[PDB]
């Protein structure tokens, strides 16, 4: 109509080159660098504060808020990239479905009787990203949340998975966690915990116990399961507790 500018045209191979070239800017490296920086900053903060100095709760809360915001931003970026991929796939499929203008089809598109997919309209109509199926729970978040209690005292029972109020009703009855193992009278140089056992072991005598047996029962009580050497993973909580205990005794 009037000025011959059609709203949209079918995709061309030359246009297809630019469509293939177009991509969302990738921030995965930037997000990984930001996560590494914040994690190392939390690790530095753990021993940065003077042991005599108390009142780190506000700093921990601020860093927790920053980490939650970063996690929300990462989830939104994942939603953005997946939405971009889906929009590109839908646009290419719609362009392939639509016929090609040769002699008069372009005139029909210009008159507006014929419509073709447009990326701008599809992007505007694209649903807003939703932070759904994303859990903001990481080992770094857990250690950041539990470090104030560890700073107050080496032994604490923060997890409330069994009961929201406490480990059992109002009374924890959890005793104390000792840095020095009864089996090996030394600090845990290699604190390793199993995903099933959920118990931290030095692994100096655990390797010897596991030697010659494919699976061995967990020495600690309150659990009945057999785990291999590969099941154990590094536990930062135990090393942080040992470091804070050493700093407090020295000061």
């Amino acid at each position: 109509n009037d000025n011959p500018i059609p709203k949209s045209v079918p995709l061309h191979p030359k246009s297809g080159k630019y469509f293939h070239n177009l991509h969302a800017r990738d921030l995965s490296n930037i997000y990984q660098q930001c996560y590494k920086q914040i994690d190392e900053t939390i690790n530095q903060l753990v021993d940065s504060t003077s042991p005599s100095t108390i009142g780190i709760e506000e700093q921990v809360a601020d860093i927790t808020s920053t980490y939650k915001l970063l996690s929300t931003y990462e989830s939104e970026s994942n939603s953005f990239d997946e939405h971009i991929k889906d929009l590109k796939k839908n646009f290419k499929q719609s362009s392939d479905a639509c016929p090609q203008i040769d002699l008069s089809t372009w005139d029909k598109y210009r008159t507006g009787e014929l419509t073709a997919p447009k990326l701008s309209e599809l992007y505007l109509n694209m649903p807003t990203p939703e932070p759904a199926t994303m859990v903001n729970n990481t080992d770094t978040l857990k250690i950041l949340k539990v470090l104030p209690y560890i700073w107050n005292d080496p032994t604490c029972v923060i997890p409330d998975l069994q009961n929201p109020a406490d480990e059992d009703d109002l009374q924890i009855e959890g005793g104390k966690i000792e840095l020095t193992c009864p089996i090996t009278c030394k600090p845990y140089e290699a604190p390793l915990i199993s995903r099933k056992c959920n118990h931290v072991f030095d692994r100096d005598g655990i390797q010897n116990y596991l030697q010659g047996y494919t699976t061995r029962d967990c020495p600690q009580a309150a659990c009945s399961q057999v785990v291999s050497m590969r099941d154990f993973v590094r536990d930062p909580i135990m090393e942080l507790r040992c470091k804070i205990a050493k700093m407090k005794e020295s000061q």
Partner: protein, 255 residues
């Protein structure tokens, strides 16, 4: 009856002349059909040459697609190797930066303690090569990271170029299938024209002979031949009305 037969011979000279004119008209119709069949054969040959050009275009395009796919597989393996290379270079850069950081912290602590002079001078002299190595490692790492990112973008664009080339080859194959359908329709039309030419040549063999007519000379134009056929038909009608009885009846009566 023999005098009537001599009159039949006089009429039959014109009758055979008309038979030759009609056989010449049928032969020219056969020649028109054959030249049109030759023109259709030239047109189908040109369409087949265009189909061969499309086929060779598809063949080179698919060869380029296969070469591009092989290059893409090799490039994916090499880019995974480059990702490991940049990761190890980043680890070496972190090791170099931490070594520089500790040596610089030691130098700054020694300088703060000074604020030993020979010791700090030698420590700085030994530390400067570590800083130079750190700078060289950082430059190599950033160059490798830039090369990896540009290569990854280029190969992603190339893979998308491969998929669009595959779509273009599918479109070319669809166009070739449409051209083959057109060729099959032209071939069935040529077969129908050839069957018609076979019927016409069988009629020409039944009526005198097609090979015995080409020697005779007559204008090629159909309108002139139709006018001559009408003229000879009128002349035969005048001869028939003068004789009264049909020539076939008179010749049968003579026999």
């Amino acid at each position: 009856a023999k005098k009537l037969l001599r009159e039949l011979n006089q009429t039959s000279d014109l009758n055979e002349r008309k038979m030759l004119l009609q056989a010449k008209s049928l032969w020219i119709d056969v020649a028109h059909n054959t030249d049109a069949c030759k023109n259709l054969e030239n047109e189908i040959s040109g369409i087949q040459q265009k189909v061969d050009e499309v086929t060779e275009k598809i063949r080179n395009r698919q060869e380029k697609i296969e070469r591009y796919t092989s290059d893409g597989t090799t490039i994916e393996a090499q880019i995974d190797a480059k990702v490991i290379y940049v990761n190890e270079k980043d680890s070496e850069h972190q090791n170099a930066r931490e070594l520089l950081r500790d040596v610089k912290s030691r130098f700054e602590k020694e300088k703060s303690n000074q604020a030993l002079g020979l010791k700090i001078e030698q420590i700085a002299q030994e530390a400067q090569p570590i800083k130079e190595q750190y700078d060289s490692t950082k430059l190599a790492l950033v160059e490798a990271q830039d090369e990896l990112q540009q290569l990854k973008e280029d190969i992603n664009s190339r893979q998308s170029k491969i998929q669009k080339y595959k779509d273009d080859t599918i479109y070319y194959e669809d166009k070739k299938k449409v051209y083959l359908e057109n060729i099959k329709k032209i071939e069935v039309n040529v077969a129908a024209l050839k069957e018609g030419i076979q019927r016409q040549i069988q009629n020409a063999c039944a009526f005198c002979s097609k090979e015995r007519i080409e020697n005779v000379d007559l204008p090629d134009t159909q309108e002139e031949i139709k006018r001559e056929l009408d003229k000879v038909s009128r002349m035969i009608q005048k001869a028939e009305k003068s004789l009264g009885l049909s020539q076939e009846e008179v010749i049968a009566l003579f026999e």
